[model samples]
Target: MTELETAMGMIIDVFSRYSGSEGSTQTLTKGELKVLMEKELPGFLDAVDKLLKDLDANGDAQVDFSEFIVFVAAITSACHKYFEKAGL
Candidate 1:
């Protein structure tokens, strides 16, 4: 697989780990997301509450894989742009 495909698989793998922890096996609750943030992305732990609230954008109180990927793309895009200035 390509590097990007591998990365996408990693995201799915990690999402499955937490999303399957409770009520819904296909989505993540705020608590699950918080734990994911704590474990997978410790740097975002401080704003987990706000992050979950925003990422659960469908008003369903849970974040599906699509929503999760949007959040991932958001951070990835931000960093990409941050480094774009360096001609990377």
Candidate 2:
């Protein structure tokens, strides 16, 4: 698979494993997802938390697929950009 596809798959797997088997397309609670982010991408947890809070709009402390996807894109883009700029 291409890098993007691989990244997408990894995101899904991590979310599924960490958030419980809420099916393939269901949402995840913010707290559960935050813990996963902390474990898998320690350095980015703060930013992820901030974004998640913003996306949680209804004050329900959960994230739906749309919100999750945007958050994931932000994180993956940052990772790629940081490495590329550092010439790694």
Candidate 3:
């Protein structure tokens, strides 16, 4: 599969692994979100509060798929920016 396709599947797979931790709305609860950050990308932050707020526009405390996708894209974008400036 293509890179984009693989990434897309990854989003689904990871979200699926994390989402139902608290309930079954096919969305992520706050604790689950925190766990994702902890396990997938430790020491990640500031970026997090902003991303949470961005996804939690309704302040429902539950992040659905659309918002989850945005969250992933935002993280990917942030990581990209970090890569561009770092001596990697």
Regions of model 1 farther than 4 Å from truth: 86-88
Cα error of candidate 3 at position 36, Å: 1.1
lDDT of 3 by residue, 9-54 (tens): 9889988888877886497777788888798778866565666677
Write down the TM-score of every candidate: 0.87, 0.60, 0.73
Give each model's whole-structure lDDT.
0.88, 0.70, 0.79
Best candidate, lDDT? 1
lDDT for each residue of candidate 1 in 1-88, tens digit (9 for 90 to 100): 9998999899999999999988899999888998888898887654766877888878888999999999889988999998898884
Better candidate number, 2 or 3, judged by TM-score: 3
Order of the predicted models by TM-score, top scorer first: 1, 3, 2
- TM-score result, candidate 2: 0.60
The residue pairs in collision within model 3 are none
lDDT of 2 at 25: 41
List, residue by residue over 1-88, the lDDT tens digit for candidate 2: 9998997898777766766634334666756676776787687546656766887756766776666777678777898999899994
Ranking the candidates on lDDT from highest down gives 1, 3, 2
